[PDB]
Amino acid sequence: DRLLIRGGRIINDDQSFYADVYLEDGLIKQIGENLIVPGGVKTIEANGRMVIPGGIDVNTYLQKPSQGMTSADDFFQGTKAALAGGTTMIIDHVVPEPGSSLLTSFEKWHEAADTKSCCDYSLHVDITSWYDGVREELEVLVQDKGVNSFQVYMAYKDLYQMSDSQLYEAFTFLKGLGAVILVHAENGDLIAQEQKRILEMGITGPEGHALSRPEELEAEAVFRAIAIAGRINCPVYITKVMSKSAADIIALARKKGPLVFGEPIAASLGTDGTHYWSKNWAKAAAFVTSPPLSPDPTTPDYLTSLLACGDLQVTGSGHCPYSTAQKAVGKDNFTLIPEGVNGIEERMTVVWDKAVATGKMDENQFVAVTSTNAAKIFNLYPRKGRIAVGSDADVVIWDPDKMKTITAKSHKSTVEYNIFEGMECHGSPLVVISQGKIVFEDGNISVSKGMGRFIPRKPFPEHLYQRVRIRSKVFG
Amino acid sequence: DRLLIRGGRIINDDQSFYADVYLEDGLIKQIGENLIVPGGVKTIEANGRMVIPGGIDVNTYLQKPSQGMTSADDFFQGTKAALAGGTTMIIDHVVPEPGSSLLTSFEKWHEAADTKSCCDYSLHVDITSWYDGVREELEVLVQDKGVNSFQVYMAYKDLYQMSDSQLYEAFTFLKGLGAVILVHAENGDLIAQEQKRILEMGITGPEGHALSRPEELEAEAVFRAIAIAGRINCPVYITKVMSKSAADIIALARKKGPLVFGEPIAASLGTDGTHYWSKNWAKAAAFVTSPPLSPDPTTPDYLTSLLACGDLQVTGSGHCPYSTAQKAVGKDNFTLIPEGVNGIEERMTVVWDKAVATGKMDENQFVAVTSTNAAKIFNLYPRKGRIAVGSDADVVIWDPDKMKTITAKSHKSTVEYNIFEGMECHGSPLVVISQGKIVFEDGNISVSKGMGRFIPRKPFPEHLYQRVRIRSKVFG
């Protein structure tokens, strides 16, 4: 259906300018000084408000398994929540069941999302084990299924953990396929050692989670992953950056040569781990995620600073909350608490408040860290993350001047708690458009279950492999 | 005049793609897979070669006065050499006399460039002293003449040097006018002291120029510049970054918040100061520029790496050589040697060889550091530094695999020496187009004296001031 947005200020990552935008059949058809559309056309008066590209959440775990329980917000509830918060595309993590192949898991996820997602989506495939034959499936996932990104774990001893030798093999094989390599960086062996010790001191509450996974163990894994990537000459992406230490490791590496990217999430940009010490067991348990929120209160402002100067490039949510009932399964042993916090709905609002409202970065840089950088890294650029003729009509009309107190009573998540409870933000979504259709307006959501399309991605993203290709020919 | 570039691979700072480009009347009229062109239109077959935005040399001193003499390459010779090197625009520094009229010097520089320049140009206005009434003239240059950039000096005691009180006053006023504040950062008092001391010892050769201006003095001046800018909350641009020390200061400051931009030049990116110790006085004196080339051999590679990671954003040449006979006006006292080196013609080839051919950055980042970044900072963005419909037709067909050994025996400058003598680079221009007209093709240059237009620029470049505005409203 034809839709005209008039009087708006278009904000892309490279510049801002006034013009109207004309949408038709999921595409941006025209941008220009004034008029040019048929007489019958629904019209939205932006009246000076910002017209920006819909957000791309590079990290979601909507159907994540944890302690035998599935994350609380499914593909429907989850994407509905995303759209209400201004995010029009997600890249969800496929997590294979024990003893299941990668192709079987992809098919399960794909079928699931296709029947419930309210918006467009892509899929990451989590390689939980380097088994004989995995190489063939990966080739099929890249070449035929359209999956260009994969994650390997450095933590979760005896479960998902990959040894240095296996990590070297995986990075090498993945680079050959032109894939984007993601890492969950925490030293699992040392974490296992600390869990035992902490539980021995009689510490059973959530604070035990933070205490068994100190940031020094995250930073160390990040460094080791960067060392491997550097020897292999392949890009490496660090998911869920939660600490000042890990962030500095990445910063230092960037000026050295290694092609390393950093992904902080809403949680680490908007709150901290002091809440693991709440008297209320349920509130504390709701903050349990891995890596954990840093107990150092200076962390959120510091990570935002690094995102502003370019040492960190994209923002995600790591969304995968569990209800109090599900969390309670470990009311006694903190190591039995399902891991995951909310943030898919709050991401763009939280980033705007902590980065733009404070003056650390401007609106153009806001677009880059919420969509454009993500698009260039995962090979979806022009199509997504840019208001331009020919791109997909995933648009948001943002109003920098007002409204937003984050509360569990008004959020879209099905869970009881919210790690950003009480946070008042200045700047939020007014109108959300996906696939050329209005899904959020006048403070209300209007979605269609299953309307979302799966977006396949080609390997060898230029932003990543151009430098890789030169280096392989210059340093042989 | 109509011109079609066919079969090329367009390279912008944000992406690359195959499409033909159609030029008409100084503008890029169409970009696309094919078709839509009149029969009698001159066509160029790119044959898969790179089609990029013409370079922008943010730093030129074509009519610079020094020791009572004028620089060797004037507006005609200088721009001719720039075009031959792939640079289609320069922003030259107007250098006013002893407390004379800024407006009058502007008028003189403008008249010369409009009569001699081969390509479009803009003008910087150097504030050689804060004489009473300078404010009034500055306001006119900005609002009426279209000058949005001004440079202040921290060196040259009793000549151009401004005190901290004056610097503070100038940054504050210039911020008020929304200008881009450039700084020549070296501690003039300490340099004056060391010059005396070095001469007293009997060291009068060019090595004394380097010895009397150690990088510790450039770094301290740079640090102090940023400190003032932080208190005032205004953007600050560091011209001619020549040392690792100075580059590290800027890098640390970027993570802290202050809006600081760094400008390394061809000289510091492609050679070093070991040549000041050359037996050949003439050769050594040819390297005399301030700040001086660093004697540390590791400097060029280091600066290139920080340019690639984003700590330094633009590249200039600082072109303003003097013939040997002119330099020789101080063969018995290095303090009387006219300051200035070559680089305007070599800039893009040198940057390509040190940054892209080594794999530190790819072709898109190359475009950013040679034109686009400069365009955004100086408010010339969409029109310059981008291959898009509506932008000026300043284009270059670049061949990534075609050697070019730089020699004074064949360079376009008029001077006898070349600081890049013997350097063999792998990447040079094949065709250069200015204002939609071919000025370089088949190895031959064809330019029209006085064809270049003066490009006026508006104050308050969004890229710089959006953040400034937020900060002013949040930290009062």
Side-chain angles (χ1 to χ4, degrees), chain A residues 1-32 36 38-328 330-476, chain B residues 1-32 36 38-328 330-476:
Chain A
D1 260 288
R2 309 175 179 170
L3 183 51
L4 177 78
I5 302 178
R6 279 189 35 197
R9 176 170 187 257
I10 301 176
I11 313 292
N12 275 323
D13 71 315
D14 64 325
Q15 62 168 154
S16 300
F17 63 101
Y18 292 84
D20 309 312
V21 186
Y22 182 53
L23 313 174
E24 173 164 50
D25 284 305
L27 293 169
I28 300 179
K29 298 287 175 55
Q30 299 180 54
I31 297 170
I36 298 185
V41 184
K42 188 199 177 77
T43 292
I44 296 178
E45 295 305 328
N47 293 84
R49 266 51 183 282
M50 314 172 113
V51 181
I52 67 174
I56 303 179
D57 193 332
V58 296
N59 193 332
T60 62
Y61 273 85
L62 302 191
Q63 272 186 69
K64 178 196 177 188
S66 187
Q67 291 302 317
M69 300 176 273
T70 310
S71 190
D73 301 321
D74 67 8
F75 268 110
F76 178 65
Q77 288 301 307
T79 55
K80 179 192 302 169
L83 289 174
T87 287
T88 50
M89 202 199 155
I90 66 176
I91 311 183
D92 197 74
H93 282 270
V94 176
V95 176
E97 225 175 54
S100 63
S101 79
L102 304 180
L103 296 178
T104 301
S105 303
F106 172 70
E107 170 184 55
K108 196 174 79 180
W109 248 258
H110 186 29
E111 167 174 51
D114 262 353
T115 55
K116 288 182 170 182
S117 189
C118 301
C119 65
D120 288 335
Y121 64 98
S122 279
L123 298 173
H124 291 121
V125 165
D126 282 25
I127 305 176
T128 42
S129 76
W130 206 239
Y131 60 82
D132 224 82
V134 67
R135 298 183 185 238
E136 290 64 40
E137 300 182 65
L138 297 175
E139 307 184 312
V140 179
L141 287 162
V142 173
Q143 172 193 292
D144 310 319
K145 303 302 183 176
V147 172
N148 70 356
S149 50
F150 303 79
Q151 181 181 296
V152 297
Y153 297 80
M154 289 181 78
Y156 300 111
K157 181 187 183 59
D158 295 320
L159 179 71
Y160 302 155
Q161 186 170 290
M162 209 168 265
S163 78
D164 293 339
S165 292
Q166 294 183 301
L167 289 178
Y168 179 103
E169 227 166 71
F171 281 32
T172 299
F173 186 73
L174 288 175
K175 163 184 160 180
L177 298 184
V180 184
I181 300 163
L182 280 65
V183 186
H184 183 294
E186 275 189 307
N187 187 299
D189 286 328
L190 297 183
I191 282 174
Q193 295 305 290
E194 288 294 280
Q195 277 178 169
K196 288 170 58 64
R197 191 173 76 69
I198 301 289
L199 280 175
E200 265 173 30
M201 273 153 83
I203 302 168
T204 46
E207 68 276 35
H209 186 64
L211 300 162
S212 58
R213 300 169 183 265
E215 65 176 277
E216 290 70 32
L217 300 183
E218 171 191 13
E220 188 286 310
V222 176
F223 197 28
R224 182 151 35 103
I226 291 176
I228 298 182
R231 299 279 69 226
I232 295 169
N233 171 48
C234 73
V236 64
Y237 181 117
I238 303 303
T239 67
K240 298 191 277 185
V241 180
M242 247 85 290
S243 69
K244 298 167 69 177
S245 291
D248 285 331
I249 297 298
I250 296 170
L252 166 56
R254 293 190 62 252
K255 68 190 294 301
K256 291 190 170 182
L259 304 175
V260 51
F261 300 79
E263 179 203 84
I265 59 178
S268 58
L269 291 174
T271 192
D272 61 42
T274 57
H275 306 287
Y276 289 126
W277 281 257
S278 179
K279 290 295 205 177
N280 174 341
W281 193 89
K283 184 177 183 186
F287 285 78
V288 176
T289 172
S290 293
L293 276 298
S294 165
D296 182 334
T298 70
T299 305
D301 178 85
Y302 189 75
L303 294 181
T304 301
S305 291
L306 263 56
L307 182 65
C309 66
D311 286 322
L312 299 178
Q313 313 64 44
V314 296
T315 63
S317 71
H319 192 90
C320 52
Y322 292 78
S323 70
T324 302
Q326 299 179 300
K327 287 287 183 178
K331 57 179 192 293
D332 302 313
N333 189 324
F334 70 79
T335 76
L336 301 174
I337 300 181
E339 307 178 324
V341 294
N342 66 285
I344 193 174
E345 189 193 319
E346 302 82 19
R347 185 176 63 100
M348 284 173 96
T349 298
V350 164
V351 172
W352 179 277
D353 190 70
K354 300 287 295 197
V356 189
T358 56
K360 285 183 143 65
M361 72 173 58
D362 60 30
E363 54 266 51
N364 308 94
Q365 291 171 281
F366 175 68
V367 177
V369 302
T370 55
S371 74
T372 320
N373 287 345
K376 295 174 177 169
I377 294 173
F378 288 109
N379 222 356
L380 302 150
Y381 178 44
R383 173 189 239 168
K384 304 296 185 184
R386 187 176 186 72
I387 300 306
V389 174
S391 301
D392 286 0
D394 289 340
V395 190
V396 172
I397 295 183
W398 191 272
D399 172 351
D401 277 332
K402 76 137 208 191
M403 82 313 236
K404 190 49 182 160
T405 296
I406 299 176
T407 68
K409 56 188 181 305
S410 66
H411 72 194
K412 290 290 184 291
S413 185
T414 63
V415 303
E416 303 83 357
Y417 284 84
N418 191 131
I419 65 177
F420 304 116
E421 190 67 57
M423 181 184 277
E424 39 207 305
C425 314
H426 333 68
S428 63
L430 264 187
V431 175
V432 178
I433 295 162
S434 176
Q435 294 201 245
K437 294 172 177 176
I438 295 180
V439 293
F440 182 82
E441 78 180 326
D442 311 324
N444 281 272
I445 196 75
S446 188
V447 291
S448 252
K449 182 154 57 55
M451 185 66 44
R453 310 172 294 172
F454 168 74
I455 307 294
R457 296 159 297 150
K458 290 176 70 272
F460 293 102
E462 294 278 62
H463 190 233
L464 266 67
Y465 284 90
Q466 282 171 141
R467 271 168 291 184
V468 167
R469 291 194 179 90
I470 300 172
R471 301 180 183 185
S472 300
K473 182 172 178 72
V474 152
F475 296 113
Chain B
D1 217 71
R2 296 178 154 167
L3 180 55
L4 176 61
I5 305 180
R6 274 191 59 206
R9 182 176 175 254
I10 296 183
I11 312 284
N12 278 318
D13 73 313
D14 67 321
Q15 58 164 167
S16 295
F17 62 103
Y18 287 97
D20 298 331
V21 189
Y22 182 59
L23 309 177
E24 184 175 50
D25 297 314
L27 294 170
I28 300 179
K29 290 303 177 62
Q30 299 177 58
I31 295 173
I36 318 164
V41 180
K42 187 180 172 314
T43 305
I44 299 173
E45 289 294 320
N47 289 150
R49 261 56 149 286
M50 291 172 271
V51 181
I52 74 180
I56 300 180
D57 192 329
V58 290
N59 197 326
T60 61
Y61 273 82
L62 299 193
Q63 275 186 46
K64 174 184 170 182
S66 185
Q67 294 305 324
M69 297 174 281
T70 296
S71 205
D73 307 321
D74 63 31
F75 272 116
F76 173 65
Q77 286 297 304
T79 59
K80 190 211 293 182
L83 289 172
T87 291
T88 52
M89 204 199 168
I90 64 169
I91 307 180
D92 199 77
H93 284 268
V94 172
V95 184
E97 314 180 304
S100 41
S101 170
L102 293 188
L103 283 174
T104 297
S105 280
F106 172 76
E107 150 185 59
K108 197 183 79 188
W109 252 260
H110 178 51
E111 177 183 48
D114 266 330
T115 56
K116 296 190 166 187
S117 187
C118 304
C119 63
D120 291 342
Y121 63 100
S122 269
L123 300 169
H124 287 137
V125 175
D126 284 19
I127 305 176
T128 55
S129 77
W130 213 245
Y131 62 84
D132 197 71
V134 68
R135 292 171 168 259
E136 286 63 36
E137 295 197 63
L138 288 169
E139 295 183 299
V140 173
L141 285 160
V142 165
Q143 177 204 292
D144 300 320
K145 309 299 184 173
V147 178
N148 73 1
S149 50
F150 308 77
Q151 181 184 294
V152 297
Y153 301 80
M154 290 176 72
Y156 303 112
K157 181 177 173 53
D158 297 319
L159 186 47
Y160 302 149
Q161 188 171 310
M162 254 185 289
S163 71
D164 289 334
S165 295
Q166 290 182 288
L167 285 170
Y168 181 102
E169 177 165 341
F171 281 27
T172 295
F173 187 67
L174 291 170
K175 171 187 172 181
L177 304 175
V180 184
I181 304 169
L182 280 63
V183 185
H184 180 303
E186 295 186 280
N187 189 298
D189 291 338
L190 298 175
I191 288 178
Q193 294 298 304
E194 284 291 290
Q195 275 172 162
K196 281 191 51 183
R197 183 176 85 69
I198 301 296
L199 286 178
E200 314 255 300
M201 300 181 96
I203 302 185
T204 62
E207 65 271 42
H209 179 71
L211 297 175
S212 54
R213 292 162 161 281
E215 59 172 288
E216 287 74 14
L217 301 195
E218 173 189 12
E220 179 283 313
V222 170
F223 192 19
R224 178 156 33 94
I226 296 170
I228 295 176
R231 300 296 66 221
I232 294 170
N233 165 50
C234 62
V236 65
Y237 180 116
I238 307 302
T239 64
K240 303 187 284 190
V241 175
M242 248 83 293
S243 68
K244 293 165 60 181
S245 282
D248 284 332
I249 295 291
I250 299 177
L252 177 61
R254 294 193 58 256
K255 308 206 299 66
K256 293 183 179 189
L259 308 171
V260 52
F261 299 76
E263 181 205 86
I265 54 177
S268 62
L269 297 172
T271 192
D272 62 48
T274 52
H275 305 287
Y276 288 122
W277 283 265
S278 173
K279 293 287 177 189
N280 186 336
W281 184 92
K283 175 183 186 182
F287 285 69
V288 173
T289 175
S290 297
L293 275 301
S294 166
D296 184 332
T298 65
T299 307
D301 173 272
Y302 193 69
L303 295 175
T304 296
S305 297
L306 264 64
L307 178 61
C309 72
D311 287 316
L312 297 172
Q313 313 62 43
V314 304
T315 61
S317 59
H319 194 88
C320 56
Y322 289 76
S323 63
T324 296
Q326 289 177 303
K327 288 279 187 176
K331 78 285 199 176
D332 291 305
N333 184 334
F334 70 79
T335 65
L336 305 180
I337 306 180
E339 306 191 327
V341 297
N342 73 276
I344 195 178
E345 187 196 327
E346 297 78 27
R347 189 177 65 97
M348 287 184 83
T349 298
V350 168
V351 172
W352 179 275
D353 183 80
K354 305 286 296 182
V356 186
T358 53
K360 286 175 177 302
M361 73 174 55
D362 60 38
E363 54 261 51
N364 306 103
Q365 292 170 281
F366 172 69
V367 177
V369 294
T370 53
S371 79
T372 318
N373 288 352
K376 293 167 176 170
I377 295 165
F378 289 114
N379 226 359
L380 295 158
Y381 176 46
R383 73 183 310 179
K384 304 299 187 184
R386 189 180 188 69
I387 302 302
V389 176
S391 299
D392 289 0
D394 287 350
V395 184
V396 168
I397 296 183
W398 187 275
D399 194 323
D401 315 298
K402 108 105 105 170
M403 322 159 291
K404 165 58 176 155
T405 293
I406 302 167
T407 50
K409 90 180 188 307
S410 66
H411 69 192
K412 290 309 196 294
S413 175
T414 71
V415 309
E416 303 95 326
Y417 282 84
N418 191 132
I419 61 184
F420 302 120
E421 188 63 47
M423 182 187 293
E424 57 188 285
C425 319
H426 341 80
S428 54
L430 245 190
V431 179
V432 178
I433 302 169
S434 176
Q435 294 190 271
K437 291 185 153 181
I438 299 170
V439 293
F440 191 71
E441 72 174 322
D442 310 320
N444 302 315
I445 121 135
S446 172
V447 299
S448 297
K449 205 175 71 64
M451 181 80 94
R453 309 169 299 171
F454 165 70
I455 309 291
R457 304 161 293 156
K458 299 155 56 191
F460 296 108
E462 302 272 61
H463 190 228
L464 271 61
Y465 285 85
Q466 273 166 151
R467 274 171 289 181
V468 170
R469 291 185 178 102
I470 294 175
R471 300 179 183 195
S472 303
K473 193 174 179 51
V474 164
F475 294 105

